[PDB]
Structures are given as structure tokens and as C-alpha cells.
UniProtKB/Swiss-Prot annotation, chain A:
Matching SUPFAM superfamilies: WD40 repeat-like
Gene responsible for this protein: GNB1
Provenance organism: Homo sapiens
Record PTM text: Phosphorylation at His-264 by NDKB contributes to G protein activation by increasing the high energetic phosphate transfer onto GDP.
Swiss-Prot/TrEMBL GO biological process terms: adenylate cyclase-activating dopamine receptor signaling pathway; cell population proliferation; cellular response to catecholamine stimulus; cellular response to prostaglandin E stimulus; G protein-coupled acetylcholine receptor signaling pathway; G protein-coupled receptor signaling pathway; phospholipase C-activating G protein-coupled receptor signaling pathway; Ras protein signal transduction
Protein name, as recorded: Guanine nucleotide-binding protein G(I)/G(S)/G(T) subunit beta-1
Curated annotation (Swiss-Prot), chain B:
Residue ranges, Cytoplasmic side: 27-36, 100-115, 195-222
Effect of F168A: Decreased G-protein coupled receptor activity
Endoplasmic reticulum as UniProt keyword: no
Protein residues bound to serotonin: D82, N244
Function: G-protein coupled receptor for 5-hydroxytryptamine (serotonin), a biogenic hormone that functions as a neurotransmitter, a hormone and a mitogen. Ligand binding causes a conformation change that triggers signaling via guanine nucleotide-binding proteins (G proteins) and modulates the activity of downstream effectors. HTR4 is coupled to G(s) G alpha proteins and mediates activation of adenylate cyclase activity.
Annotated protein name in UniProt: 5-hydroxytryptamine receptor 4
Gene Ontology molecular function terms on file: G protein-coupled serotonin receptor activity; neurotransmitter receptor activity; serotonin binding; serotonin receptor activity
Gene that encodes the chain: HTR4
Whole sequence portion shown: 19 to 329 of 388
Membrane topology: Multi-pass membrane protein
Similarity field: Belongs to the G-protein coupled receptor 1 family.
UniProtKB/Swiss-Prot annotation, chain C:
Shown residues in whole-protein numbering: 6 to 62 of 71
Cellular component GO terms, alphabetical: extracellular exosome; heterotrimeric G-protein complex; membrane; plasma membrane; synapse
Organism annotation: Homo sapiens
GO BP terms, alphabetized: adenylate cyclase-activating dopamine receptor signaling pathway; cellular response to catecholamine stimulus; cellular response to prostaglandin E stimulus; fibroblast proliferation; G protein-coupled receptor signaling pathway
Protein name: Guanine nucleotide-binding protein G(I)/G(S)/G(O) subunit gamma-2
Family named by the database record: Belongs to the G protein gamma family.
UniProtKB/Swiss-Prot annotation, chain D:
Gene Ontology biological process terms in this record: activation of adenylate cyclase activity; adenylate cyclase-activating adrenergic receptor signaling pathway; adenylate cyclase-activating dopamine receptor signaling pathway; adenylate cyclase-activating G protein-coupled receptor signaling pathway; bone development; cellular response to catecholamine stimulus; cellular response to glucagon stimulus; cellular response to prostaglandin E stimulus
Annotated Mg(2+) binding sites: N46, T55
Effect of Q78H: In pituitary adenomas; also found in a patient with severe Cushing syndrome
Entry's localization field: Cell membrane
Protein name as annotated: Guanine nucleotide-binding protein G(s) subunit alpha isoforms short
UniProt key word Hydrolase: yes
Species assigned in the record: Homo sapiens (Human)
């Protein structure tokens, strides 16, 4: 009984790998050779946001491309007006060890979570004008690593219990649960259409999940280390991952395998965050060695470097309009680069 | 011999270079700036640079030329600047020692909160302003010369030749009071603070050694550091301030060569300070290595 | 034990994964290139906008 | 367009209101020392937490010593996959490690605790974090060793080759076997901690009971010593 199933698993791996190899005739590098290189991307610090007492670990951009939310381990969840640098709000969190924060697409709500095992939803613009915990999405048995709003009523979360869940905010219960991951889940990324999302985990594998049907469509195992970051290519047909392997890997949902990799001999440390520009040509990733390397998504050459942080760059995010990219770090400062 | 010109110029250059390196390392290294303890070191470096730019070159000119040509008013101004900056540097050293003792023994667990900007400003104000009351206020009014004016005239000129040179002489009350205020009281405070720091370091090292012996699979560093610091300070200043105490009481018979030697020993303190409080600090060494990497 | 159930779920999920349709890698690379070129003109980071339009001046 | 000026004034007044609150919170944040509490569930960690007090993944506790605020966070209810969330506590003043010294002959819980201590001490992100090692359940250890049925001599074969250190300071009336077992257990952890030999962080073992009321004083003294040693090492005094 059990023995036959395990052998079938190896045969299944074999056929999947054979098909993936058959789909590979040329690499993205080979086809990209004739394309004009992007060149040296020049960027320097534009806005410096101060006020966080402790190391900042997560941030998110609002759809308006002006409002920014960041979370710090000191227990402060601050909302910034990137244009004017003014702090719109400073939400005091119940638990100081927040590890994730999210900003609703309509901007009405803000989510955060961490070692508390609870995702707290905050209503920013109640008629009274006071930020309060609308509801607590308890139920997870591990620390929340990432969360992203699908709408004002739905939010997907990743946790240390190796399972992701879709929550109906009004009811406060898991609409759907994702349990395909064997290791700790670290990062989440919603597709542009919100029909699919992909989660990276410490098992070195990335899984593509269907929000409505609650199952993983594909599994990618190119990485050989803990995956810390993940982000879709802007068209939604591909995504890139960051891991402690000191390399970035790009995967296409249709190809069902790694397309191309980003690495260098001068980088040996892990990767904390990854993001794409509006056109997807530039892949921006944060690294443990206090700087962010800008990679040509097609060529995978160091187009630029951001080094305005004195400590681990924990998070990175590009505006929906592509005007600027914000970066958080453990030095308690956000640097906006344009 | 004119070899003294090379030596004095080299001393001035090294002092200026060390102070400028300290200041630029603190300014560039924004991680040093966030620590208020570094503010005392920056102030000490600035005071030493001021000594090296406004006091050392003037004394070197007085020595190599052996004649003062800028007049008695600028003689008084130079003496006041020398006293002010010297006492400011000594007070900066004393305050650094006291702050280290406070952080280690007194309030280690709330040191960061107690070191408010008000405290730092008050300590630096004490270091920079208190010297004014003993350097400029007495010298400009001539209180140091009253009662010994006749002796100053004899010492003012080596009348065998037409040479004239700027002089600084102190009577018994001014000498005693200023020496006590500038060196002896700060010296005692530094000695007490560093002895208590030594006791704390010795007990900590004894505990560490006991734990290491327990964990074996088969304490004198603080003494060395404090000995280096205090020996440098003493060799620089104690001879000068002991001569100043004994000089008035022996009818001012001390030869000029000894006075000059002790004065320049005191000056050397400003050159050694960058290489003592920054070299013997982990953060400053890290910053210096980062700068050297360029 | 739950080993048998876990193995059954694993084989079911792998069977679902294998059945998906996979398109040529060169086709995916061409699609990514097409998207990049079609939007490269509208990427401020790829091509800096003039100071007047940039809101951060 | 006076609306622009009005919005600017509103934004700046809100900014200053938030900034004053952040400054106020800053003083309490710096005046407080954060602590991480670790140890197996069967250890006396829960009893120590209860004493200091008198299903979330973090149980924070508030206690003050000599007007010094301490925030301890029990990471209990977390899964055994510790290599990720442990990075969050790289800036804590000290990690309080609780080990049931009497649990050598249970599974091999003492060996598991030793391995956990090794992993935490050698952790990449905890290089500068000191560990306050509470060898808990001393009374149970004394009861089990005094009975004579304990076979510790072969559960840890190095015990038969081990003797009480000359620096031992046993309590009055303490049995020689109890002292020998206590110091053998302590040295087992000290071997792991001493191996670094770098001085960036230190271990502070203690012989404590689950209901020991002085544990708070032990934590205070350990934090004071950690800060003192950090300052001394900064000034080349260690
Ligand atoms: C890099 C900067 C931020 C370090 C800050 C250290 C502060 C304490 C230092 C830097 C420059 C220093 C000032 C420089 C100039 C003088 C003139 C002197 O007649 C009185 C002291 C005073 C006014 C110093 C006070 C202390 C000072 C303000
Ligand atoms: C830290 C404070 C105490 C420093 C200020 C010390 C002041 C009070 C000291 C320094 C030099 C001193 C003067 C030195 C010379 C004399 C001549 C003597 O015949 C009368 C007192 C008089 C005039 C002293 C008065 C007090 C004095 C001005
Ligand atoms: C200005 C000249 C005289 C200073 C000469 C340095 C002398 C005074 C210094 C050098 C070493 C110092 C001693 C070193 C440490 C001890 C041990 C303890 O008991 C405290 C004082 C005492 C005894 C110090 C007294 C002052 C001391 C003797
Ligand atoms: C740290 C200090 C105590 C070290 C010792 C300083 C010594 C070198 C100082 C203190 C007092 C000084 C003496 C003071 C008086 C005179 C008389 C003069 O006609 C010759 C020099 C002589 C003899 C000085 C020589 C140097 C001297 C002995
Ligand atoms: C005459 C003596 C004056 C002494 C003045 C002491 C000033 C203390 C300053 C404390 C640190 C200030 C840091 C910010 C400085 C700045 O605004 O550039
Ligand atoms: C300088 C004033 C404060 C005191 C600081 C220096 C203390 C000097 C102690 C001298 C005796 C040292 C004996 C060390 C013996 C050993 O190496 O084991
Ligand atoms: N060159 C030493 C100037 C100086 C500083 N402080 C002093 C005190 C008394 C004295 O005579 C002189 C001084």
C-alpha cells in the first residue's frame, strides 16, 4: 500500500522533470543576447522617513502611489505620505513583534501580523477618524510571515505553520486553507487579476495557488535554500523569488519551471525582498549586506545598486504607478529611490 | 640647532591630522553620531585641534625665532588662548572618564536615557566655559602678575641683547588656584573613576576566567589600558603642573629649558589624545578601518 | 497512522500537477520580451522622467 | 488655491502630533530592556513566568527592578522550526534559557536542551546576544540524586570522569553528590558556551528553583553585568 504510493511519487517526479526538460530548448539568456542592454540604472536617496524606534521589517505601497505603510518591531505601524514625508498615522500594535503589514487596495483598511499568530485589520478612515482594530483573524498556529488584501473583505495570509489561508474579514473565519507547503511559508504575492497567488516557503519550493478553488496548481523547486521573497512579473505570467541561496530565480507559470537566474560572485548573503518595476524589465531585490541590487530582468546584469541603508534591508516595494521604489531596513529608516 | 623646527612642525602636523581624522570619522560614520558618548570625543578632538592651530604654532614661532614681535596685547591673548584650550582639553578628558565611569558602574541599565541632550550640553559647557574664568578673565585683567610685577621685569628681557619675548608668570595664589582647578581636581576625579572602572573590569574578568576554567575541555587588559591612558596624561601634564606649584615657592629659579620642555610635553597631549581615546575604542577603530578602505 | 493518507494526498496532487499544459520556453521568453518592450517606454525607473513631471522634486 | 495651504497645515499638525507621541514612546522604549525566554515545555519556564508576573505565539510579561523596566517575551506556542523567527530577537539584551537539570534520565531531554543551547549560541544572528542560563528544578534534581536510584553515571558517561571544581560554592548542608551533579550539568553547558572564546557574548548559568523568587534579581544582575561587559569591551577593558 504505502510502498507503491512512494514509488509512484518518484515516477511522478521523473515524468514531471522529463516534461520540464523537454519544454527547454533555449534559455532566456540566449534569446536576450541580441536585445539592447538596459545599461547602468542611476538612483539615489530621494526621501528619508524617520520615526520608527526599532528595526523595520515590512512595508507596503498604497494603490494611490502616495500613501505608504511600514511596520517596525517596536510595535509602531506608521502610515507615511511619501510626497510630503508627513506621518498620517502611527498605529500602536498590541504585539510589538510584527512581521508583516499590508495596505488595502481601496486604502480603507490596513493589516499586520507576526509572532502574535494573529492578523489585525485596522480601519483607517472610520467616521470617527480613529484607527482601531476592526477584527483579529486568529486561528493560525504559526507566526504570520506575509499578508495581502484581495479586497476590503478578503485577505490572504502566510504563517509559520506551513499553511496559507484566505480569510473573510467580516466573518473572521478562514474561507479557504492552503496546506501543500511542507516548510515555513515566508512570502506571498497576489497576481494582477487576484485569481492566483504564489507563496514561497523554507522548503525551497514555490507553489502557485488558486484563490477560489483552494489548491496549488504548480510547484517550483529551483531554489535550494529558504525562500524569503516572492513577486509576480507585472503581466502575471511569471514570478521571481528571493532566498538565502544568494540568488534570484524567475519562473513562468506556463513553462512550469525556472526561466533564468540572477547571481554574482561578489554576493554571498541572503535575499530579503524582491520586486518588479512597472514594465517588469528591472528586478529590484534587497540583500542582507545592507544594499539592494537592481537586476535586468531579461539580462540579469547589475544595472544599479542602492546602498543608503546601514543595516539589513528587510523589505522593498515599487509604487503601482512606477514613480518610485521604497526600501526599508533594520536601521529604522525608509529610503525612497527614483 | 634648527632641528627643533622639524620636530615641532611634525608634532603640530600629527596632532592636526589626528584630530581631523577623528572629527571626519565621527561625522561620516552616522552610526557613531547616534551615540551621545561620541560627542565628548568630538569636542575633545576639536579642542585639541584648536590647541594645535592657535597655541602650538605660536609657541614654535617663539622658540625658533626666540623673539616675540606681535606686542604685549597679543602676548596676553596667546597666553589666554593657551590656558583656555589646555584647560578645556583637560576637562574634556576628565568628563570622558566620568561619563565612562557613570555608564559602567553607576547607571549601566539606564545610561542611554540619562544621557539626555541637556546633560551633554551642560557637560560640554562646563568644559568650554569654566576655562574662560581662569584663562581670559585673570590674564586680561593682569591678576596673575600683581605682587610679582618686579620679578616679571627682570625675567621679561635677557638684556645682554636686544631680544624680547612673550612671558607668562604666575603668583602663588593664581598658580595654586589654577593648578588645582585645571589639573589636580580633574586628575583626582579621573583617578577615582578609572580605579572604580578597573575594579569592575577586574571582577568581570575574574568571573569570565572562572567560567572559562569550568568550561575548559582539557584580567590585566583593563589594567594595561588604564595604565597607558593615565601614564600618557601624567607624563604630559603632571610635570608642568608640579613645576607650576613649586615654581613660585623657589623664587622663580626654574630654568627656562625645563619650563619649555614641560610646556611642550603638555602640548603633546593634544597629539596623543586622538590616538588614545579613539584607538582604544572598538567603534572608532572600525570607523578608521572603514575610512582607510576608501 | 497518517502516513498513508499523506502519501495518497501527495500522489493526487502530483497527478494534478503533471496533467497541466506546458508551453515552449522560447515562447515564454518572447512573451516576456514583448511585455517589456511594450511598457519600457512607460517605466520611470528604466528611463528617468524629467524633473518637472517627477513629483519628488 | 488656499485648499493646498489648508491641507498642508493639517498634514503638518498631524505630523507634529504623531512626532510628539513617538518621542514620548522613545523614552520608555530605550529605558526598557527586552528579553527572550526559551526552554522546553516540560521545563519550569511557565512557573518562572508566573512568579515574575506575581494561545498567541508570544506571551509578553511586565516586571520592573530598581525602577528598570524589563519586557520578557515567551516564544512558546511556536513550532520547533526556530531558525526563522529567532532572527527577530537579535537585539534583545539577554536570552533567558531554562533547562530542567533534573531531566537527564527522562527521552534524553537534557541532551536535547544541550543541542538547542549549542544551536542558539552558535546562531548566526545571535553572535552578540548573551544567554541567561537558568538550570531550573534544582530541588527535583536534589531529590532524585539523594535517593540514590539515579544512574547519571552512564546517562552521561563523562560524569564518572568528572569531579567538583575547586571554585564551587555549594550552599550550607548541600550533599557532595548534589553539588557534583549540579556542577557537571553546569559545565556541560559552559563547554558549549566557552567554545566561542570571542567575548562578543557570555553565558550566565544559575542554580534556580521553579518557584525561586530571586530569579527576578538574577535577571536584573545578569542584564547589568551584560551591559557592563559590553561597555568594558567597547573601551578595550575586556
Ligand atoms: C557630527 C556632529 C553632529 C557631532 C556633534 C558633537 C557636538 C557636541 C560638537 C560638534 C561641534 C562642537 C562645537 C564646535 C564649536 C565650539 C566652539 C567653542 O568655542 C565652544 C564649543 C563649541 C560650540 C562646540 C560644542 C560641541 C559641538 C557642538
Ligand atoms: C572653577 C572656578 C572656581 C574658577 C574661577 C577661579 C577664580 C575665582 C580664581 C582664579 C584666579 C584667581 C585670582 C588669582 C590672583 C589673585 C591675587 C590675590 O592677591 C587675590 C585673589 C586673586 C585675585 C584670585 C581670585 C580668584 C581667582 C580669580
Ligand atoms: C601629579 C602626580 C603626583 C601624580 C602621580 C601619580 C600617582 C599620584 C598615582 C599613580 C598610581 C595611583 C594609585 C593607583 C591605584 C591606587 C589603588 C587605590 O588605593 C586607589 C588609589 C591608588 C593608591 C592610586 C593613588 C594615586 C597614584 C599613586
Ligand atoms: C609625574 C611627575 C611627579 C614626575 C616628576 C616630575 C619632575 C621631573 C619635576 C617635578 C619638580 C621639578 C623640579 C622643580 C625644581 C627644579 C629646580 C631647578 O633649579 C632645576 C629643575 C628642578 C629640579 C625641576 C626638575 C623636574 C622636576 C623634578
Ligand atoms: C561655549 C560652550 C558651548 C557648548 C555647546 C554644547 C552643545 C551641545 C550639543 C549636543 C548635540 C547636538 C547635536 C545636533 C547638532 C546640530 O544641530 O547640528
Ligand atoms: C590608573 C588609575 C586607576 C588604576 C588602573 C590601573 C591598575 C594597575 C594595577 C597594577 C597591578 C596589576 C597586577 C597584574 C597581575 C597579573 O598579570 O596577573
Ligand atoms: N600651557 C598650560 C596653560 C595652563 C592651563 N592651565 C593652567 C593653570 C595655571 C597656569 O599657570 C597655566 C595653565
Amino acid at each position: 500500500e504505502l510502498d507503491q504510493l512512494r514509488q509512484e511519487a518518484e515516477q511522478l517526479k521523473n515524468q514531471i522533470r522529463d516534461a520540464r526538460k523537454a519544454c527547454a530548448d533555449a534559455t532566456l539568456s540566449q534569446i536576450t543576447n541580441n536585445i539592447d542592454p538596459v545599461g547602468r540604472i542611476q538612483m539615489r536617496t530621494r526621501r528619508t522617513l524617520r520615526g520608527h524606534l526599532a528595526k523595520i521589517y515590512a512595508m507596503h505601497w498604497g494603490t494611490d502611489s502616495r500613501l505608504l505603510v511600514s511596520a517596525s518591531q517596536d510595535g509602531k505601524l506608521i502610515i507615511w505620505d511619501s510626497y510630503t514625508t508627513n506621518k498620517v498615522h502611527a498605529i500602536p500594535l498590541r504585539s510589538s513583534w510584527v512581521m508583516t503589514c499590508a495596505y488595502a487596495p481601496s486604502g480603507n483598511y490596513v493589516a499586520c501580523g507576526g509572532l502574535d499568530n494573529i492578523c489585525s485589520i485596522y480601519n483607517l478612515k472610520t467616521r470617527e477618524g480613529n484607527v482601531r482594530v476592526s477584527r483579529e483573524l486568529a486561528g493560525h498556529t504559526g507566526y504570520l510571515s506575509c499578508c495581502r488584501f484581495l479586497d476590503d473583505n478578503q485577505i490572504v495570509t502566510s504563517s509559520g505553520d506551513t499553511t496559507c489561508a484566505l480569510w473573510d474579514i467580516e466573518t473572521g473565519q478562514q474561507t479557504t486553507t492552503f496546506t501543500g507547503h511542507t516548510g515555513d511559508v515566508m512570502s506571498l504575492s497576489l497576481a494582477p487579476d487576484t485569481r492566483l497567488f504564489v507563496s514561497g516557503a523554507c522548503d525551497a519550493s514555490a507553489k502557485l495557488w488558486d484563490v477560489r478553488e483552494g489548491m496549488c496548481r504548480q510547484t517550483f523547486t529551483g531554489h535550494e535554500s529558504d525562500i524569503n521573497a516572492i513577486c509576480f512579473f507585472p503581466n502575471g505570467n511569471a514570478f521571481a523569488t528571493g532566498s538565502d541561496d544568494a540568488t534570484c530565480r524567475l519562473f513562468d507559470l506556463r513553462a512550469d519551471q525556472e526561466l533564468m537566474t540572477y547571481s554574482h560572485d561578489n554576493i554571498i548573503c541572503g535575499i530579503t525582498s524582491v520586486s518588479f518595476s512597472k514594465s517588469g524589465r528591472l528586478l529590484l531585490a534587497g540583500y542582507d549586506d545592507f544594499n539592494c541590487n537592481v537586476w535586468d530582468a531579461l539580462k540579469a546584469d547589475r544595472a544599479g545598486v542602492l546602498a543608503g541603508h546601514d543595516n539589513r534591508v528587510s523589505c522593498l516595494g515599487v509604487t503601482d504607478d512606477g514613480m518610485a521604489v521604497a526600501t526599508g531596513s533594520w536601521d529604522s529608516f525608509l529610503k525612497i529611490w527614483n | 640647532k634648527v632641528v627643533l623646527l622639524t620636530f615641532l612642525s611634525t608634532v603640530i602636523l600629527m596632532a592636526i591630522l589626528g584630530n581631523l581624522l577623528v572629527m571626519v570619522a565621527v561625522c561620516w560614520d552616522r552610526q557613531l553620531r547616534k551615540i551621545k558618548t561620541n560627542y565628548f570625543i568630538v569636542s575633545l578632538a576639536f579642542a585639541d585641534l584648536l590647541v594645535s592651530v592657535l597655541v602650538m604654532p605660536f609657541g614654535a614661532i617663539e622658540l625658533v625665532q626666540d623673539i616675540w614681535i606681535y606686542g604685549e596685547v597679543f602676548c596676553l591673548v596667546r597666553t589666554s588662548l593657551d590656558v583656555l584650550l589646555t584647560t578645556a582639553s583637560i576637562f574634556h578628558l576628565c568628563c570622558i572618564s566620568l561619563d565612562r565611569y557613570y555608564a559602567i558602574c553607576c547607571q549601566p541599565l539606564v545610561y542611554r536615557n540619562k544621557m539626555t541632550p541637556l546633560r551633554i550640553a551642560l557637560m560640554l559647557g562646563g568644559c568650554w566655559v569654566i576655562p574662560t574664568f581662569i584663562s581670559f578673565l585673570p590674564i586680561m585683567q593682569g591678576w596673575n602678575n600683581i605682587g610679582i610685577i618686579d620679578l616679571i621685569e627682570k625675567r621679561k628681557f635677557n638684556q645682554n641683547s636686544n631680544s624680547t619675548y612673550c612671558v607668562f608668570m604666575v603668583n602663588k595664589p593664581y598658580a595654586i588656584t589654577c593648578s588645582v582647578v585645571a589639573f589636580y581636581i580633574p586628575f583626582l576625579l579621573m583617578v577615582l573613576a578609572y580605579y572604580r572602572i578597573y575594579v569592575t573590569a577586574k571582577e568581570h574578568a575574574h568571573q569570565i576566567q572562572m567560567l572559562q576554567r569550568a568550561g575548559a575541555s582539557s584580567e590585566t587588559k583593563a589594567a594595561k589600558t588604564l595604565c597607558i591612558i593615565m601614564g600618557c596624561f601624567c607624563l604630559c601634564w603632571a610635570p608642568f603642573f608640579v613645576t607650576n606649584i613649586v615654581d613660585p615657592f623657589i623664587d622663580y629659579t626654574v630654568p627656562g629649558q625645563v619650563w619649555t620642555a614641560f610646556l611642550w610635553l603638555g602640548y603633546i597631549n593634544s597629539g596623543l589624545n586622538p590616538f588614545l581615546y579613539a584607538f582604544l575604542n572598538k567603534s572608532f577603530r572600525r570607523a578608521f578601518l572603514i575610512i582607510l578602505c576608501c | 497512522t497518517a502516513s498513508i493518507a499523506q502519501a495518497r494526498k501527495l500522489v493526487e496532487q502530483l497527478k494534478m500537477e503533471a496533467n497541466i499544459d506546458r508551453i515552449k520556453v522560447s515562447k515564454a521568453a518572447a512573451d516576456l520580451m514583448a511585455y517589456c518592450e511594450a511598457h519600457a517606454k512607460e517605466d520611470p525607473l528604466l528611463t528617468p522622467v524629467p524633473a518637472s513631471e517627477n513629483p519628488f522634486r | 488655491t488656499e485648499d493646498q495651504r489648508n491641507e498642508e497645515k493639517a498634514q503638518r499638525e498631524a505630523n507634529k502630533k504623531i512626532e510628539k507621541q513617538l518621542q514620548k514612546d522613545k523614552q520608555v522604549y530605550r529605558a526598557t530592556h527586552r528579553l527572550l525566554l526559551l526552554g522546553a515545555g516540560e521545563s519550569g519556564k511557565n512557573t518562572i513566568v508566573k512568579q515574575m508576573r506575581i494561545t498567541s505565539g508570544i506571551f509578553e510579561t511586565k516586571f520592573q527592578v530598581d525602577k528598570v523596566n524589563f519586557h520578557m517575551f515567551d516564544v512558546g506556542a511556536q513550532r520547533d522550526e526556530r531558525r526563522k523567527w529567532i532572527q527577530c530577537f537579535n537585539d534583545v539584551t539577554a536570552i533567558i534559557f531554562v533547562v530542567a537539570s533534573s531531566s537527564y534520565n527522562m527521552t534524553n531531554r537534557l541532551q536535547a536542551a544541550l543541542k538547542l543551547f549549542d544551536s542558539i549560541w552558535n546562531n548566526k544572528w545571535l553572535r552578540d546576544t548573551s544567554v541567561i542560563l537558568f538550570l531550573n528544578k534544582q530541588d527535583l534534581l536534589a531529590e532524585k540524586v539523594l535517593a540514590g536510584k539515579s544512574k547519571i553515571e552512564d546517562y552521561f558517561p563523562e560524569f564518572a570522569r568528572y569531579t567538583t571544581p575547586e571554585d564551587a560554592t555549594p550552599e550550607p548542608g548541600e550533599d557532595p553528590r548534589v553539588t557534583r551533579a549540579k556542577y557537571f550539568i553546569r559545565d556541560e553547558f559552559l563547554r558549549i558556551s566557552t567554545a566561542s572564546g570571542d567575548g562578543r557574548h557570555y553565558c550566565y548559568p544559575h542554580f534556580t528553583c521553579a518557584v525561586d523568587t530571586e530569579n527576578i534579581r538574577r535577571v536584573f544582575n545578569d542584564c547589568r553585568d551584560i551591559i557592563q561587559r559590553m561597555h568594558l569591551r567597547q573601551y578595550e577593558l575586556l
